Design a protein around this ligand. Structure first.
Ligand SMILES: Cc1cc2nc3c(=O)[nH]c(=O)nc-3n(C[C@H](O)[C@H](O)[C@H](O)COP(=O)(O)O)c2cc1C
Ligand SMILES: Cc1c(Oc2c(F)cccc2F)c(OC(C)C)nn1-c1ncc(C2CC2)cc1F
Ligand SMILES: O=C(O)c1cc(=O)[nH]c(=O)[nH]1
Length: 347
């Protein structure tokens, strides 16, 4: 099985509930209140596993405390030619250049509408839903693509993600620069504020691990100025850290998994400091263990996500991360996850 074939089968099996229901019962230690919601546990599935919102209920069954679908583009688009996903088994890493393959807003809108009240119950029970918004390859006006996403899927989401950090769409990461970023996020927040109160989601910005010090300072400034609700830190890296062994290490695309882990943790640490710990962070990149999760929480993450670990450990990795995180919190004298958020910054 090539990686993309495995991905398609994984989504199909998850959607059909063909996996053991997670025996691990979440303790009160793992509960987090952030972004106006209760999260039963802080371990989410990152964007790019369920791009088209086909497997949401199966992912809650796997034991995730929250699910992020997408990225979703306004119009349907095929993304890049195959092959476009590469396994680096020696590195516990993946390189992908999917290029925002998307069923598009209308198809995803109808899928989420079909289970909207089921989701309202799950959200009330501490299992929220995120929607990650992308832009079409041929789009002239990036802000209008994101605005369309807010209008169509904002009403169906607990939080929205403005993905300005895909490495696989020409000119996208340049939306991370200051004057353009202020214009883009002002338009996104105006559109969000225009939705009816019960349909009004939190808005987060998802950033690359590949930003300059200047880029990070500029993002922190704009996020505080505009009242952005949170940051997702980080997307995949276009860097190739020294020591990658995989034969496929020089494939074009975003690198995920263990080689991204500490680059992502350091970006969390920097963004927490630049926002004075006042901007909730979802920490993501190379999480495979309770230790990986707690390092991101101590660096300033309120929640974490994983993806690549699923491809090396399978579905059991979710319960593993939760059980190890609970054990480490007890060992280090934390009452719960909330007490550990940003603990490294208090020395
Ligand atoms: C195959 C693949 C597809 C992805 N697609 C998306 C996407 O559509 N939108 C997005 O924001 N991030 C996407 N990501 C990035 C993940 O959400 C996450 O930020 C990154 O993989 C780091 O987490 P991990 O090391 O636990 O996989 C994708 C990652 C992979 C491996
Ligand atoms: C998470 C996941 C599986 O694990 C399972 C499961 F073994 C049973 C049910 C659900 C699952 F997710 C799996 O099982 C293969 C189909 C045997 N593949 N896989 C996987 N997922 C995503 C990708 C992305 C391209 C990078 C690649 C993959 F290999
Ligand atoms: O669709 C993709 O190529 C994709 C998008 C994104 O945000 N991140 C990633 O690694 N791949």
């Amino acid at each position: 099985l090539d990686p993309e074939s495995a991905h398609r089968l994984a989504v199909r099996f998850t959607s059909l509930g063909l996996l053991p229901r997670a025996r691990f019962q979440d303790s009160d230690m793992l509960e987090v209140r952030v972004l106006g919601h209760k999260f039963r546990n802080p371990v989410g599935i990152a964007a790019g596993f369920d791009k088209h919102g086909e497997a949401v209920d199966g992912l809650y069954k796997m034991g995730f405390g929250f699910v992020e679908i997408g990225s979703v583009t306004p119009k349907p688009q095929e993304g890049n030619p195959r092959p476009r996903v590469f396994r680096l088994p020696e590195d516990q890493a993946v390189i992908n250049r999917y290029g925002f393959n998307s069923h598009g807003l209308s198809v995803v809108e109808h899928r989420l509408r079909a289970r909207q009240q089921k989701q309202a119950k799950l959200t009330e029970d501490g299992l929220p839903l995120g929607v990650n918004l992308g832009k079409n390859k041929t789009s002239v006006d990036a802000a209008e693509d994101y605005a369309e996403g807010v209008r169509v899927l904002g009403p169906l989401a607990d939080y929205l993600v403005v993905n300005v950090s895909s490495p696989n769409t020409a000119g996208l990461r340049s939306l991370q620069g200051k004057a353009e970023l202020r214009r883009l996020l002002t338009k996104v927040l105006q559109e969000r504020d225009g939705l009816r109160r019960v349909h009004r989601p939190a808005v987060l910005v998802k950033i690359a691990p590949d930003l300059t010090s200047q880029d990070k300072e500029d993002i922190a400034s704009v996020v505080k100025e505009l009242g952005i609700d949170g940051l997702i830190v980080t997307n995949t890296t276009v860097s190739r850290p020294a020591g990658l062994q995989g034969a496929l290490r020089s494939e074009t695309g975003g690198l995920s998994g263990k080689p991204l882990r500490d680059l992502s943790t350091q970006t969390i640490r920097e963004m927490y400091a630049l926002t004075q710990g006042r901007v909730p962070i979802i920490g993501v990149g190379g999480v495979s263990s309770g230790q990986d999760a707690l390092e991101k929480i101590r660096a300033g993450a309120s929640l974490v996500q994983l993806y690549t670990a699923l491809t090396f450990w399978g579905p059991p990795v979710v319960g593993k991360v939760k059980r190890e995180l609970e054990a480490l919190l007890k060992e280090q004298g934390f009452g719960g996850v909330t007490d550990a958020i940003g603990a490294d910054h208090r020395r």
